[PDB]
Amino acid sequence: MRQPRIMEEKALEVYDLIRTIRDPEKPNTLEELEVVSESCVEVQEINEEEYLVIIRFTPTVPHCSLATLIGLCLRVKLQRCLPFKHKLEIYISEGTHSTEEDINKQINDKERVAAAMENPNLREIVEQCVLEPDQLEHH
């Protein structure tokens, strides 16, 4: 039998979508902060008009106040900017010895993602983070 389909160029496009997101505190991008790389991202076919997207990242600090908001930016950027039925899955592993399991729930559960977008402060930070820098060559 033949080998299955692999969405390798979709994984390249998904990577470039998140590559230019900014950190919740720093003005520099997730790539400049070393948060992500090609091997962080994967994509699979569900049907010819429906697809699974997977990201497994490492945050700038092992603290929920940034780690949630980075994984929310990953989800929120791709879920709004991608065409057609792309199903997102976002994962993380840094924390104390427990926090990491709640951060996975906060960044990837649909009701937690909706609650983070209903909250005005988290929304306003995420909007500034998911919008990419133009140049900013001030120094």
From Swiss-Prot:
GO terms for biological process: chromosome segregation; protein maturation. Substantially enriched in macrophages. It comes from the Eukaryota. Keywords: Chromosome partition, Cytoplasm, Metal-binding, Zinc. The keyword Amino-acid biosynthesis does not apply. One of its GO terms (cellular component) is nucleoplasm. It is found in: Cytoplasm. Zn(2+) 1 binds at residues 63, 97, 124, 127. Component of the cytosolic iron-sulfur protein assembly (CIA) complex, a multiprotein complex that mediates the incorporation of iron-sulfur cluster into extramitochondrial Fe/S proteins. As a CIA complex component and in collaboration with CIAO1 specifically matures ACO1 and stabilizes IREB2, connecting cytosolic iron-sulfur protein maturation with cellular iron regulation. May play a role in chromosome segregation through establishment of sister chromatid cohesion. May induce apoptosis in collaboration with APAF1. Belongs to the MIP18 family. Monomer and homodimer. Component of the CIA complex. Interacts with CIAO1. Interacts with IREB2. Interacts with APAF1. This is Cytosolic iron-sulfur assembly component 2A. The chain holds residues 28 to 160 of 160 of the full protein.
